[PDB]
From TrEMBL:
<dbReference type="Pfam" id="PF09261">
    <property type="entry name" value="Alpha-mann_mid"/>
</dbReference>
<dbReference type="GO" id="GO:0004559">
    <property type="term" value="F:alpha-mannosidase activity"/>
</dbReference>
<keyword id="KW-0479">Metal-binding</keyword>
<dbReference type="InterPro" id="IPR028995">
    <property type="entry name" value="Glyco_hydro_57/38_cen_sf"/>
</dbReference>
<dbReference type="InterPro" id="IPR037094">
    <property type="entry name" value="Glyco_hydro_38_cen_sf"/>
</dbReference>
<dbReference type="GO" id="GO:0030246">
    <property type="term" value="F:carbohydrate binding"/>
</dbReference>
<keyword id="KW-0378">Hydrolase</keyword>
<dbReference type="InterPro" id="IPR011013">
    <property type="entry name" value="Gal_mutarotase_sf_dom"/>
</dbReference>
<dbReference type="InterPro" id="IPR011682">
    <property type="entry name" value="Glyco_hydro_38_C"/>
</dbReference>
<feature type="binding site">
    <location>
        <position position="216"/>
    </location>
    <ligand>
        <name>Ca(2+)</name>
    </ligand>
</feature>
<dbReference type="Pfam" id="PF01074">
    <property type="entry name" value="Glyco_hydro_38N"/>
</dbReference>
<keyword id="KW-0326">Glycosidase</keyword>
<dbReference type="GO" id="GO:0009313">
    <property type="term" value="P:oligosaccharide catabolic process"/>
</dbReference>
<dbReference type="InterPro" id="IPR015341">
    <property type="entry name" value="Glyco_hydro_38_cen"/>
</dbReference>
<dbReference type="GO" id="GO:0006013">
    <property type="term" value="P:mannose metabolic process"/>
</dbReference>
<feature type="domain" description="Glycoside hydrolase family 38 central">
    <location>
        <begin position="246"/>
        <end position="319"/>
    </location>
</feature>
<dbReference type="InterPro" id="IPR011330">
    <property type="entry name" value="Glyco_hydro/deAcase_b/a-brl"/>
</dbReference>
């Protein structure tokens, strides 16, 4: 007395090397897949690995086969998508993940492919909500359970595991199958058994398998079918929410990635989206191209910096290209936008310019704007003489004014004289850089100003810094730079004080691109007993800044042993190498900057890294010992607990807080952090290492990160827990500069001051503003930082939003009202028609 079981054999690809070498092999794999599809009528389907890009890469080498490809996708014999590319998810932005799915989706429609499950063959809490917002209610992970995200959004999930190996003989196969079957049924919760078939003669072998077992039916199948079958008979089983040394391998790739992400998501996209109002066009196709290029840097063996030298050089080009497209589109957008602004309101002879808050946040910053002050075309004289004319010429004092004509406090930072050229004409031009203080400027808005000859209206009030003691202060905070060059800070509003901040710490690293490993006898070097050179560089009533220089004596490299232990592939934990006894001076140079209207401190650290096998972090002792901390993640701030080390991955910031106080450290492209047991927040600036690691020996000398680096990060203190979120918002806003463009005096359709979107206040992450693909509907997306139901209402000009959509920009199932509170941890998208 038994019960029958169905075994679903699903064929799929299961497969260090330079890009092209893997690309040529791809061509071969897809050749064979397609050879079976055409030849073997019994062959159900093949699973094309969760990513559409594989067709692109295939067809760019082999375009004649497009017809064969369309056919097999249309007959459901090739199963493609739903992502564009398989992404190293933790490492990239919130939006990059979404955009992967958006592109993946649209590319699947282009093929007439129906939606496949999300596919995760190798390796973030909001995945459940994200998938559902992309209509992927099932996903497969490399036996079956639900996975719920922070929003109580739930997804069905498969734990599959691959357990030509199949024999051609009856006696062998019987035992073979009996054994694989036991392995499958151990974990299975139904009588529907998944059996993955990896590739790199199955109809024959399946039919043998059906001959052999009366209680087992063996069928060549696919995920779609197996999902429908298994879900109807499911009993049990839930997983909830959510090595990090890949976060700090090859920093410069992380820095670049951050930069182009922010260039597309926060600059180019919102500006184009506004420019459409005037122009009636939106460059959908170019954006799509920019994003693909960027996303090609996003796999699980590329952005991690955890591969071979040639591959990462390749990523550098892709980064520059997408960045250049980003800049191009943003430039077009602002030129179209400023041209339409009515600047006739400035007097004759004035030099107008426009500031855009292109983020969703109240922005406060002392900003600089470079304004062209005189221009000499090459047709006026010999260029060298034009240069010297302007360079010799003495410069009038200048005033900035608003549209009403009132004066606006400012400061002239710098004069420059240089060569330039326009469209659509070469010249010499003279430029001024003007400092302006911008305070709580409204999200998604612009203001116009003009530079006019006259007496500069000086900033007024106390100097922020007092250089005699290396101190500075505003209403929010008071700062002392110690002889150390470390900072002691007082929160003027909570009374909490903090000490030893900004200490730098260097240790050896003899691990590899994947993992950090400190030589067994290494105690580390620190700037705690270093004598800093401290200089006040700027002091005004609105902004002050200090330069801190430190020389530490660092080992030049690991000693001689390392290269041998790498060559012998000696396991990293067993390594006897130590820091070298040859020491050289290592210069660390930090700018600490403070502005009147903000509690944030900004740091810029610069090094010229000419030493190897090491790691440099900056520490922020917190004074609070807790079990948990908070880190920025994916559409989410996650609570985590704090191999003796505990490296972790962060986005914009990490936070440690009490019932009474908190410290928020934010960063651009500095993705690894540790929170030490004493409460120190240690951010990794740079990790230098000689090999790839893993299963063999692959020298990666370029992973040593030699050369000049500048790291941007910062600090914010808060009081009672609730104040956390404002610090998080500012951290986002800090990564998004104002855009500044000059224009001529001209009349226009548009106001010189305007709020394009008026946004709801409260703990919300503002994330995308763009337009929809054939529709051109304005798309805006944001997310709830909190576990609470939050009043949220968006307007564009007067106008309210049409509907709420999902991440593919389609209306929600069911229809939630635009008017409705933003649910806990909700990722919301608005459509504006
Ligand atoms: Ca059978």
């Amino acid at each position: 007395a038994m019960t029958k079981k169905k075994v679903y054999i699903v064929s799929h690809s299961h497969w260090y090397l330079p890009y092209e070498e893997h690309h040529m092999r791809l061509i071969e794999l897809v050749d064979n897949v397609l050879d079976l599809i055409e030849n073997d009528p019994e062959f159900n389907s093949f699973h094309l690995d969760g990513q559409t890009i594989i067709l692109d890469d295939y067809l760019q080498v082999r375009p004649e086969k497009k017809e064969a490809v369309k056919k097999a996708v249309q007959a459901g014999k090739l199963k493609i998508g739903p992502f564009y590319i398989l992404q190293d998810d933790f490492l990239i932005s919130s939006e990059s993940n979404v955009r992967n799915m958006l592109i993946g989706h649209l590319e699947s429609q282009k093929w007439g492919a129906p939606v496949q499950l999300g596919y995760f063959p190798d390796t973030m809490g909001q995945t459940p909500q994200m998938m559902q917002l992309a209509n992927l209610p099932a996903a497969a992970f490399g036996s079956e359970m639900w996975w719920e995200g922070p929003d109580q959004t739930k997804i069905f999930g498969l734990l599959f595991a691959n357990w030509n190996e199949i024999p051609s003989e009856k006696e062998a196969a019987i035992a073979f199958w009996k054994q694989k079957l036991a392995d499958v049924e151990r974990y299975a919760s139904t009588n529907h058994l998944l059996m993955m078939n990896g590739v790199d003669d199955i109809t024959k072998a399946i039919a043998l398998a059906n001959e052999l077992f009366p209680e087992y039916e063996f069928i060549h199948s696919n995920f779609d079918d197996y999902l429908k079958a298994v879900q109807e008979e499911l009993p049990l089983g839930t997983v909830t929410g959510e090595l990090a040394n890949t976060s700090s391998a090859r920093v410069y790739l992380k820095q670049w990635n951050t930069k182009v992400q922010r260039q597309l998501e926060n600059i180019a996209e919102p500006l184009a989206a506004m420019a459409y109002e005037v122009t009636g066009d939106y460059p959908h196709d170019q954006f799509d191209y920019a994003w693909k290029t960027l996303l090609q840097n996003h796999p699980h063996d590329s952005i991690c910096g955890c591969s071979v030298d040639e591959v990462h050089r390749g990523m550098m080009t892709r980064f520059e290209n997408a960045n250049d497209v980003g800049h191009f589109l943003a430039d077009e957008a602002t030129r179209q936008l400023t041209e339409a602004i009515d600047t006739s309101v400035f007097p004759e002879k004035a030099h107008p310019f426009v500031l855009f808050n292109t983020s969703g946040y109240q922005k406060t910053e002392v900003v600089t704007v470079e304004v062209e002050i005189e221009r000499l075309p090459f047709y006026t004289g010999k260029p060298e003489d034009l240069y010297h004319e302007l360079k010799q010429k003495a410069t009038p004092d200048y005033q900035v004014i608003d549209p009403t004509g009132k004066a606006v406090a400012s400061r002239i930072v710098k004069e420059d004289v240089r060569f330039g050229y326009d469209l659509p004409q070469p010249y010499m031009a003279k430029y001024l850089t003007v400092e302006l203080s911008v305070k709580e400027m409204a999200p998604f808005s612009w203001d116009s100003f003009a530079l006019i000859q006259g007496e500069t209206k000086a900033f007024e009030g106390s100097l922020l810094a007092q250089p005699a003691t290396n101190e500075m202060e505003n209403e929010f905070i008071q700062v002392k730079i110690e002889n150390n060059g470390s900072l002691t800070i007082a929160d003027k509003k909570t009374g909490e004080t903090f000490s030893k901040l900004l200490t730098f710490e260097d240790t050896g690293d003899i691990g590899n691109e994947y993992i950090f490993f400190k030589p067994t006898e290494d105690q580390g070097i620190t700037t705690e007993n270093v004598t800093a050179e401290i200089t006040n560089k700027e002091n005004s009533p609105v902004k002050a800044s200090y330069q801190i220089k430190q020389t530490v004596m660092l080992p030049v490299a690991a000693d001689e042993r390392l290269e041998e232990e790498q060559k012998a592939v000696r396991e990293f934990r067993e390594r006897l190498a130590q820091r070298s006894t040859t020491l050289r001076p290592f210069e660390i140079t930090t700018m600490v900057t403070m502005i009147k209207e903000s509690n944030q401190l900004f740091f810029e650290t610069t090094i010229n890294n000419q030493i190897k096998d090491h790691r440099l972090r900056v520490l922020f002792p917190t004074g609070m010992v807790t079990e948990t901390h908070e880190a920025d993640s994916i559409y989410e701030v996650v609570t985590r607990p704090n191999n003796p080390t505990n490296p972790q991955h962060q986005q914009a910031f990490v936070n440690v807080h009490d019932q009474n106080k908190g410290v928020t450290i934010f960063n651009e492209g500095l993705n690894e952090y540790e929170v030490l047991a004493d409460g120190t927040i240690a951010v990794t600036l740079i990790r230098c290492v000689g090999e790839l690691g893993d299963w063999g020996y692959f020298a990666t000398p370029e992973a040593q990160c030699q050369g000049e680096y500048t790291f941007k990060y910062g600090l914010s203190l808060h009081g009672k827990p609730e104040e956390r979120f404002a610090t998080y918002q500012q951290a986002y806003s800090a990564q998004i500069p104002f855009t500044a463009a000059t224009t001529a005096r001209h009349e226009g359709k548009l106001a010189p001051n305007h709020v394009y979107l008026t946004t709801a206040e409260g703990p919300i992450g503002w994330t995308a503003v763009k337009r929809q693909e054939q529709t051109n509907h304005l798309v805006v997306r944001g997310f709830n930082l909190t576990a609470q139901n939050i009043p949220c209402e968006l307007h564009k000009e007067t106008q309210p939003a049409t509907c709420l959509t999902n991440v593919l920009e389609e209306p929600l199932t069911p229809a939630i009202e635009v008017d409705a509170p933003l649910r806990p941890f909700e990722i919301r998208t608005w459509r504006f028609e």
